[PDB]
Ligand binder design. Sequence first.
Ligand SMILES: CCCCCCCCCCCCO[C@@H]1O[C@H](CO)[C@@H](O[C@H]2O[C@H](CO)[C@@H](O)[C@H](O)[C@H]2O)[C@H](O)[C@H]1O
Ligand SMILES: CCCCCCCCCCCCO[C@@H]1O[C@H](CO)[C@@H](O[C@H]2O[C@H](CO)[C@@H](O)[C@H](O)[C@H]2O)[C@H](O)[C@H]1O
Ligand SMILES: CCCCCCCCCCCCO[C@@H]1O[C@H](CO)[C@@H](O[C@H]2O[C@H](CO)[C@@H](O)[C@H](O)[C@H]2O)[C@H](O)[C@H]1O
Ligand SMILES: Nc1nc2c(ncn2[C@@H]2O[C@H](COP(=O)(O)OP(=O)(O)OP(=O)(O)O)[C@@H](O)[C@H]2O)c(=O)[nH]1
Ligand SMILES: N=C(N)NC(=N)NCCc1ccc(I)c(Cl)c1
Ligand SMILES: [Mg+2]
Lengths: 320, 140, 98, 95, 83, 347, 174, 63, 111
Amino acid sequence: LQYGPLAYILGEKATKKMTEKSKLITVDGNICSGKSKLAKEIAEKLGLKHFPEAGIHYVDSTTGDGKPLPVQFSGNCSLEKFYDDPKSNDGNSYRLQAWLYASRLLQYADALEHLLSTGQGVVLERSIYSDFVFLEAMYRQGFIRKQCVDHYNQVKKVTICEYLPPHVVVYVDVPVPEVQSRIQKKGNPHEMKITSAYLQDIENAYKGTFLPEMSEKCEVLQYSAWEAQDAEKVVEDIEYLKYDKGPWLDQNDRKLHKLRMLVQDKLEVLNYTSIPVFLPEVTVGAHQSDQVFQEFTELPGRKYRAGYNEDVGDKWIWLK
Amino acid sequence: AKTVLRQYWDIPEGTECHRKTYATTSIGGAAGLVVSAYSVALKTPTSFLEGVARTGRYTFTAAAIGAIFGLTSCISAQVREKPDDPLNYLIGGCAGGLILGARTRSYGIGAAACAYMGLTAALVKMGQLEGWQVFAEPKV
Amino acid sequence: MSMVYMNIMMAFTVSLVGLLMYRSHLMSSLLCLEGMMLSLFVMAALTILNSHFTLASMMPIILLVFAACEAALGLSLLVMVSNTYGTDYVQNLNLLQC
Amino acid sequence: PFFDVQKRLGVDLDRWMTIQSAEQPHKIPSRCHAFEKEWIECAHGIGSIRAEKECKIEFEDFRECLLRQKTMKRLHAIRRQREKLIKEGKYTPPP
Amino acid sequence: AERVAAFLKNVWAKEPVLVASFAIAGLAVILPTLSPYTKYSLMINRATPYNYPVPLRDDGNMPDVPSHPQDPQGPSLEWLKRL
Amino acid sequence: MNPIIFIIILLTIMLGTIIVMISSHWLLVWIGFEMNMLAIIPIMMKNHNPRATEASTKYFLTQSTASMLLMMAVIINLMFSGQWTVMKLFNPMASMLMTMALAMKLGMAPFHFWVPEVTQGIPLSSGLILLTWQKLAPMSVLYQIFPSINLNLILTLSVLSILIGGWGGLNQTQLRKIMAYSSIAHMGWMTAVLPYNPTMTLLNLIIYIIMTSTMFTMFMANSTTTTLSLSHTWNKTPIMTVLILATLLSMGGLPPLSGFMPKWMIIQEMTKNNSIILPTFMAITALLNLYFYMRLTYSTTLTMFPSTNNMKMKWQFPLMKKMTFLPTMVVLSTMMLPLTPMLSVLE
Amino acid sequence: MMLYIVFILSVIFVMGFVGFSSKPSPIYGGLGLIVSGGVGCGIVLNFGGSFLGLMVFLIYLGGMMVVFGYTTAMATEQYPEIWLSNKAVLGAFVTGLLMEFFMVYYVLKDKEVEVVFEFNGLGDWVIYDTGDSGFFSEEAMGIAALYSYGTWLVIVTGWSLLIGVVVIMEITRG
Amino acid sequence: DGPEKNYERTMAILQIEAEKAELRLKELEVRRLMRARGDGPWFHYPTIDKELIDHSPKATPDN
Amino acid sequence: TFQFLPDEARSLPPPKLTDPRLAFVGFLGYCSGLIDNAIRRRPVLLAGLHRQLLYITSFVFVGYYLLKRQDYMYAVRDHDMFSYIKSHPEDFPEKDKKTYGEVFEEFHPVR
Ligand SMILES: CCCCCCCCCCCCO[C@@H]1O[C@H](CO)[C@@H](O[C@H]2O[C@H](CO)[C@@H](O)[C@H](O)[C@H]2O)[C@H](O)[C@H]1O
Ligand SMILES: CCCCCCCCCCCCO[C@@H]1O[C@H](CO)[C@@H](O[C@H]2O[C@H](CO)[C@@H](O)[C@H](O)[C@H]2O)[C@H](O)[C@H]1O
Ligand SMILES: CCCCCCCCCCCCO[C@@H]1O[C@H](CO)[C@@H](O[C@H]2O[C@H](CO)[C@@H](O)[C@H](O)[C@H]2O)[C@H](O)[C@H]1O
Ligand SMILES: Nc1nc2c(ncn2[C@@H]2O[C@H](COP(=O)(O)OP(=O)(O)OP(=O)(O)O)[C@@H](O)[C@H]2O)c(=O)[nH]1
Ligand SMILES: N=C(N)NC(=N)NCCc1ccc(I)c(Cl)c1
Ligand SMILES: [Mg+2]
């Protein structure tokens, strides 16, 4: 039975599947802070599902054959271009940020759906709750306009309010001089053009707004670069948490049924990421969007609903 | 409303002008009061006096139209010796339309009001002669 | 008609005018709504009793029961309004103007 | 009824309380039972268009029993005249 | 059955008030249909004469209708006296 | 809401309506309205926000006032006839009170003000019930009491609704308000013909319900509540824009589409009764509705509005909303004119 | 005279309605409705509605109006504004009070009156029934019949009360 | 088609249409009479059914 | 009373299963099937033939009975009309028909 009211009526209630191990964990930090390695270790040790940080091609990974699509089907957002030309007149900076928030929103919906349908917890690397630190950093360096920030807050206002916050927020605290040291060592030509000022703004948003906010409602665990190598100590900290705050304590089968009905419908999840606000950075002219949409329909296995594409080997279409 | 309309249509056209002008002025005044009542209830005046000024403004404007139509249409029938003629009502209807332009201080509204109200009055006279029914009794 | 019907019909009209001419408190308009029911109960009871319409004797009770249930619903809406704005003032219920 | 389910099924959901001359507990009659019965029997089966004209006598009698306007008016007249004569001392009432 | 008795012992230990409520409510629904006395309730109510028993015009073909209250024909309440 | 409770509340909304439709006693009619109003408030409130609370309260006050006036008409009718049978009323004051009460429940002008505000403030699914199913019970009462209705009153209510509904929709960009004013105008056609041929009232009501349900369902499939949001449909579900175009042209009364049929038959019945000025005035006034239906078609189907970059993310996911009965409803909404003589089944 | 008791009660009925309909503080409006409810019961009592009259006291006053006052004290007014201190309330109260008195004066002077409609003024006793010698209360027999004739009334009424509980719990959960 | 076929086919069309036109005029006349007089199956508005009346002896005799 | 097809309707001939109106109803059912495929982005013509068949069958089945009621209601209308005309001969007198040789019509020249 595909999930719905009928499945819920017949005993598919969330509280059955969820244990004390059914926790949503998010790992945050500055660039090159080592959060990616820590997130995998936490997930391995606690037996949780790991979600690699949602990038420009996250949505492609969940649909079709799972492989990334060409760049015109993501709007030509480019993280590489952002470092090369953060003040480009083509609006790439905010178009990327708006796209990345939608990608994170989609991933958060996937993570909650996994948690609510299987009962197994998840580990995320950043989320829709911490995505704003990049936007604040962008605005303070003059890479995006104030109207872009106003647009971002509108979309966030009508989307984040639907979801529950993480059970545990893990923050890895690496100072900016060390981050710049790790960036140059990593040797990515585009990333090395990052300014410490941009990195300092990311940290200021994290410590000024993010951590204080999440402290009111989550379990916030902070580690330094050294303390983050001891994954076992991090996992020991997690297992000894009390979980005495947050709205996860108010949840019940009724409220989690409505939540699962939302996160499973991805078009409903992304509904307000396309509000008709005609900001130049994200507005696409009719001729271009029409042309790009026709190209998308021509991609393999994309003309029809999944399972109805004869060009990729689907069978029994005349009985489906 | 049925009593006044009974009085007006009882008098022959082109005769007893003062009685005709009273029926139409009272009819116009009633419509003005009805408009004022809804206007004041749905669009609150800033003060009691502003509400009274608006009520008088609409009510006099509507009685002015009703008076001119009745008087002009009754004189036209008398002067022309053409009682059962829609053209008298067309003349009376347009005259009332011009007043609306004056009371609303405009030339386009007056011209538009003259044509639309002038045609409407003429149609009203034809329906009276030919027994046109607006709210027809169910018959079949 | 009998003399009592004058005042009972008048009472309904008074409460109807009261209901249609709101002031500020939403509770005050709910009271006029229940006043209307009261006058309806009395008029119906008088007609039914005087005519000796035996089986209709239960009708005023049914009217009372259903109208009390409607009033309970109205009171619930009033408290939800009061929780939102801190008063039961009807001037706050103007968001759907736009 | 818009949909006459009651007649189709033969079930009596609410007809029992529609008129005062129907069956009542312990055969308690209404005051206007005989007038309602006559009017209903006159008007039965001919349609309201015809009954409005042809059963007017039964309906006028029934309405008189219901509200008693003519009776009260007649009593008002006799009482008003009696007060006049007594005010003029031309009438003394018996015990 | 054994699972039924274990369930009943559990509720009897934890919620005797609710167990008693449901048992009483179940008896109220069921016992009227099992009682031999329920039929007399119908008969006694019908035997109570609230209004006047209007006499019938005698057409000469009513041998089952009494002519006098003390004549033998008609319903008897002897069953009620012995009750 | 718990899914089982939502079902029971929906069934109570239906049961209250059914009681009104099968009752021969005026008290049961009143009970049907009371039960129906009690059960509908929870689906107006279900999304818990100040706008939904204001809509539920504005709705409650209107319907409660109308039900009190209805009970007055019933009691006055009892005083002057000594019976409760649902049929013609036996007192002109009772007839005016019941007519006014039922006009208030239907949201007819000048008792219309609540319809746009209540519809705007509740979810699309709740507005779907408000503007379709809720018309059934009051219209079925009007079907039975129409011989005693004052002709001038009912035709005045009809003419006002056609004017107010037509003019009110011209200024709207919110889809729920467009549907609300569209509903007001269509009610006027239904009551204008009722004194002459109630069968044509039923025909108009049924067809209106079908096209109204189609439009609400298509809005729900895309979660569109504003004109500009609806203008993004072409870049997501191009088929939907064509269906919306066809349905709107039908609600405009354009031949050869189904929505021409009720206007066509109402004009016929009125002309058979030597009513010529009124049907002509109604038909010309209904061009106001066609104007703001056409405006929606311009921004939805006949032109391509600007899009947003994030829309591309939507291309990768299918429609998962139920869209129940939509393929059937859209075909009935547009392609039924050749079967017009089938209206006799409603006789 | 006691022969006009029903009329006198009906006059008091109207004044109580003018009381809360002019809408003073809901505390006082609730008081005016309670006085009208009691007086309304008295009118019903004098027509032989013993059980119906007491239901107004038990249910309308002891149930509904208690809940109204409870809610007013909790979500509307905690301290009443001085009665008639507002101009519109005082004007509306005086306007209605004068209309009632003019009605009552004329009907008593002429023993009839035409206030829109024609009303007799001889006293409501004149229409009463002249024969009654049954061994039961007719009102009681009619109300008791709810359980024999009114099966359908019981079903819909009982169902609506259950839905009332369900609906109100939904409304207030928020 | 030969002229005879079209000619006589035309007559068959005229007969059908003429008969329908007469029936349309008669229906308007029948409907007008039934609505004014109420003596037909159309415009038959219900009256209370007399089988609802209880004819048994009542608690008191005068009724 | 509250009957879709009363028993007296069985004296009328049934609608033919090849009725042109019934065929149109079937076509409407076919169109609904295609629109179902289209809104769900399936191959419009081939997808779910079992579903397409039931769309046609459901429309035809319901259409057949609706057509039956339609024809019966028009038979009842004619039956009522003809009976009323027989019952009231005084209101439908047999018209005295003159020929065009005897009837005078004015001539209106087009010059
Ligand atoms: C832009 C156009 C807008 C719409 C215009 C609509 C025009 C409608 C025409 C007006 C209605 C017809 O006009 C109406 O006809 C009937 C026919 O006797 C008259 O009816 C009158 O008959 C006699 C006199 O003959 C009177 O004693 C009686 O009081 C009255 O019933 C009305 O007094 C008249 O007002
Ligand atoms: C919108 C107002 C809301 C508050 C309503 C207040 C209650 C209204 C009470 C109405 C009851 C009176 O109703 C009215 O009584 C008188 C008494 O014979 C009736 O009778 C009156 O008109 C008819 C006309 O043929 C004749 O009986 C007679 O000329 C006259 O007495 C009226 O036909 C009826 O309409
Ligand atoms: C949405 C809810 C769905 C549930 C629907 C349930 C409907 C139940 C209908 C109950 C009424 C059934 O039908 C009705 O029943 C009662 C007995 O039971 C009968 O009533 C019987 O007792 C009383 C006492 O005299 C009288 O009404 C009558 O003398 C006698 O017939 C009716 O003659 C019968 O028509
Ligand atoms: N503009 C922008 N860039 C982002 C965002 N999320 C990630 N990035 C960029 O994606 C790149 C990789 O991010 P990180 O995970 O933090 O770097 P990492 O070294 O690979 O991973 P760690 O070792 O855990 O720190 C960086 O250049 C980020 O700036 C975002 O929301 N906005
Ligand atoms: N009230 C109206 N004017 N209309 C109406 N229903 N008239 C009754 C005439 C009629 C018309 C068509 C059919 I088919 C049938 Cl059986 C009867
Ligand atoms: Mg990383």
